[PDB]
Amino acid sequence: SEVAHRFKDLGEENFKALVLIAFAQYLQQCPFEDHVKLVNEVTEFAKTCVADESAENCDKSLHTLFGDKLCTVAADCCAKQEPERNECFLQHKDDNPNLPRLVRPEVDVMCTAFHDNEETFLKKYLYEIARRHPYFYAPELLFFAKRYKAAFTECCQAADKAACLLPKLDELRDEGKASSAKQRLKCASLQKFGERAFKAWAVARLSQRFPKAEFAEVSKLVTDLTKVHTECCHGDLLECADDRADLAKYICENQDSISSKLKECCEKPLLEKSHCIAEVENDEMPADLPSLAADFVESKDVCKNYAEAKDVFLGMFLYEYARRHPDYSVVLLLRLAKTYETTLEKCCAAADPHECYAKVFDEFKPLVEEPQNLIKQNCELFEQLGEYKFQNALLVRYTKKVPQVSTPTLVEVSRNLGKVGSKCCKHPEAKRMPCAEDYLSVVLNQLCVLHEKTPVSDRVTKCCTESLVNRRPCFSALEVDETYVPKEFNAETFTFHADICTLSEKERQIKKQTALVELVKHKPKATKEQLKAVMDDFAAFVEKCCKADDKETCFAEEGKKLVAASQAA
Numbered sequence: 429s430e431v432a433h434r435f436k437d438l439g440e441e442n443f444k445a446l447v448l449i450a451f452a453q454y455l456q457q458c459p460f461e462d463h464v465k466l467v468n469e470v471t472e473f474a475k476t477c478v479a480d481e482s483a484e485n486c487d488k489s490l491h492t493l494f495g496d497k498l499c500t501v502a503a504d505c506c507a508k509q510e511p512e513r514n515e516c517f518l519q520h521k522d523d524n525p526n527l528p529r530l531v532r533p534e535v536d537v538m539c540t541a542f543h544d545n546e547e548t549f550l551k552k553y554l555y556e557i558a559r560r561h562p563y564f565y566a567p568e569l570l571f572f573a574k575r576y577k578a579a580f581t582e583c584c585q586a587a588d589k590a591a592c593l594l595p596k597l598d599e600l601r602d603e604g605k606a607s608s609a610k611q612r613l614k615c616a617s618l619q620k621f622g623e624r625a626f627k628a629w630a631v632a633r634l635s636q637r638f639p640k641a642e643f644a645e646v647s648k649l650v651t652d653l654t655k656v657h658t659e660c661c662h663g664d665l666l667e668c669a670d671d672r673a674d675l676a677k678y679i680c681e682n683q684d685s686i687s688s689k690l691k692e693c694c695e696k697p698l699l700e701k702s703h704c705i706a707e708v709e710n711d712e713m714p715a716d717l718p719s720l721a722a723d724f725v726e727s728k729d730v731c732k733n734y735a736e737a738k739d740v741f742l743g744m745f746l747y748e749y750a751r752r753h754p755d756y757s758v759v760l761l762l763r764l765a766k767t768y769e770t771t772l773e774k775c776c777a778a779a780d781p782h783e784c785y786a787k788v789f790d791e792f793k794p795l796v797e798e799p800q801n802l803i804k805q806n807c808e809l810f811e812q813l814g815e816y817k818f819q820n821a822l823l824v825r826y827t828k829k830v831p832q833v834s835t836p837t838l839v840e841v842s843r844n845l846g847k848v849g850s851k852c853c854k855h856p857e858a859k860r861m862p863c864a865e866d867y868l869s870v871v872l873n874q875l876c877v878l879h880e881k882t883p884v885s886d887r888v889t890k891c892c893t894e895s896l897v898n899r900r901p902c903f904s905a906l907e908v909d910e911t912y913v914p915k916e917f918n919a920e921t922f923t924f925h926a927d928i929c930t931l932s933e934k935e936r937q938i939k940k941q942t943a944l945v946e947l948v949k950h951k952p953k954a955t956k957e958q959l960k961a962v963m964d965d966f967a968a969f970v971e972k973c974c975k976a977d978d979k980e981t982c983f984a985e986e987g988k989k990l991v992a993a994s995q996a997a
C-alpha cells in the first residue's frame with residue numbers, strides 16, 4: 429500500500445494537512461466543508477490500510493484514490509482515467525482564480541475563532557492559501573502554517589494584539605507571495621522546458637551556495653532536489669514532502685562535505701530545518717582555486733572531453749564557474765554556459781579546434797556587462813525617484829512594449845518589477861546582480877504564466893517561450909510595439925468616484941496607476957512629459973471630490989473637468 433507507506437512517514441497531522449492542500453489546489457472553487465469532508469474520509473481509509481495492507485483498495489496509487497474522491501463532487505476530467513485523468517486536473521489549475529479578495533476580521537474575532545477551535549482555524553488558513561496559489565511549495569506551506577499558529581498563540585495573550593498580530597501577519601502575507609512566485613518559476617521550468625533546464629539551474633545555484641562541495645556531491649544534491657520539485661509540481665505532494673525530509677536529513681548528516689553554514693539549520697525542528705537549509709547563505713569561497721582557462725580553454729583535450737560526455741563536461745564547467753562567482757546571477761551563469769557550449773559545438777568541428785575556441789572568454793565580457801549596466805542605471809534612477817515614481821516609470825515602459833496585455837496584469841507585473849528597486853539597490857555591487865536579475869526572472873515568469881492563459885501579444889509569447897534564460901534580455905530589448913493600433917476612450921474607464929476615498933492609501937495609487945496604463949494604451953506615442961503633467965491632475969481630482977460636502981456627483985462633475993482637460997493634453 430502506498431497510502432499506508434506515506435502515512436507512517438508523515439504522521440497523521442502532516443498527512444492530513446498535505447492532502448487538504450492537494451485538494452484545494454486541484455478544485456480551487458469547491459467550499460472548505462467539502463474538502464474537509466473528503467480529507468477525513470480519505471484519512472480514515474488510510475488508517476484501515478496501515479493495519480490491513482490489503483483491505484479495500486490499499487493496493488492502488490495515490491492518484492487513483494485522490495482522483496476518485498474529488499470526482500464525487502465535481503466533469504470531462506473525471507470521465508478519463510488514471511494518467512490522462514490526473515494530467516487533466518494539472519492543466520486546469522488556475523493561476524488567477526476569480527476568488528473574492530480575502531479580508532481579515534478584527535483582531536478580537538480571530539483570537540476567539542483561534543482559541544475556540546484551533547485545528548479548524550488553521551485548516552482554513554491552509555485552504556485559503558492553497559486554492560489561490562495552486563503551485564505553492566507544499567512542504568513550505570506547512571512551515572508557514574506553524575509560523576501562523578505561533579503568531580496567534582503569542583499575540584492573542586498580550587496587551588495590545590492589534591499591534592502584535594497585524595504586523596507579523598503582514599510579514600507573512602508578503603513572504604508567502606514571494607515564496608509562491610519562486611516556486612511558480614520552478615514548476616514552469618520543469619513543465620515548459622524540461623528537467624535538463626531545471627538541473628542546469630540547480631547546479632549553478634547550488635554550486636554558488638556550496639563552493640566547497642565536490643562536483644559529484646552537488647550532482648547528488650541536484651538529482652534529489654530535482655525529484656522533489658518534479659513531484660511537488662506534478663501534484664504528488666505526499667511523496668514530495670517525504671522526499672524533501674530525506675534530503676534535509678542527508679544534508680545535515682553530511683554537513684562537513686557540503687557547507688559550514690548548515691550548523692544552525694540542523695539544530696532545529698524538521699519543518700524549520702528544511703526551510704533553513706533552503707535559505708542558507710553562500711559558504712566562503714575556497715582559497716586556492718586554479719584558473720578556469722586551464723582546463724576549459726587552454727587544454728587541448730577540450731573537444732575530446734566534450735565529445736566523451738557533453739553533459740558531465742558542461743555540468744562541470746557550470747559548477748566551476750558558478751562556485752567562484754557568487755557575484756553573478758544564476759541566469760547569467762546559464763547564459764555563459766550556453767555561450768561556451770555553442771562555441772565548442774561549432775569550434776570542435778573545425779580544422780584546428782584550439783584556435784577557434786581560444787577566445788571564448790572575450791564572448792563573455794559583453795554578456796557580463798549588460799546586466800551590470802542595467803542594474804547600475806535603474807538603481808541610480810530608483811534612488812532619485814523613490815518607489816512609487818519608479819514603478820510608474822516601469823509602467824509606462826512596459827505598456828509601450830506590450831500594449832495588448834490586460835491592464836490588471838500590467839499594473840501587477842510593473843508594481844512587482846518596481847519592488848526590485850527597494851529589495852536590491854541597497855546592496856553593494858557584489859550582491860546586486862544575483863538579487864536583481866534573478867528576482868526579475870521570477871516576476872517576468874508571472875507575466876508569462878498569466879499571459880499564457882489568454883494570449884494577446886505575439887511579443888510576450890516569443891519572449892516567454894524562446895529561451896528560459898534569455899527572457900529578461902528579450903523583454904529589455906523591446907521598445908515600442910510599432911504595429912499597435914491606439915485604443916478609443918471609454919467614459920466608464922476614466923470616471924473617478926468617491927468610492928476611491930474609502931480605499932486605502934495604496935488602493936489609490938493602484939487606481940491612478942491603472943488610469944496611467946489606460947492612458948498610455950490610448951496614446952502610445954505620448955511622452956513622459958505630458959503623462960506626468962496629467963498624473964498630477966488626477967491627484968487633485970481625488971483630494972477635492974473626496975473632501976467636499978455631500979458629493980458623490982462631484983465624481984461626475986469634477987470628473988467631467990478631468991476628462992475634458994485629459995482629452996486636451
Ligand SMILES: CCCc1oc(CCC(=O)O)c(C(=O)O)c1C
Nearest residue numbers: 633634649653672675705706707
Ligand atoms: C539541496 C540544497 C538545499 C535546498 O535548496 C533548495 C532550493 C532553494 C532555492 O531555490 O534557492 C531546496 C528546496 O527547494 O526545498 C533545498 C532543500
Ligand SMILES: CCCc1oc(CCC(=O)O)c(C(=O)O)c1C
Nearest residue numbers: 802803806845848864868903904
Ligand atoms: C532594476 C532592473 C529592472 C528593469 O529595468 C528596466 C529598464 C532597462 C532600461 O533602461 O532600458 C527593465 C526593462 O526594460 O525591461 C527592467 C526589467
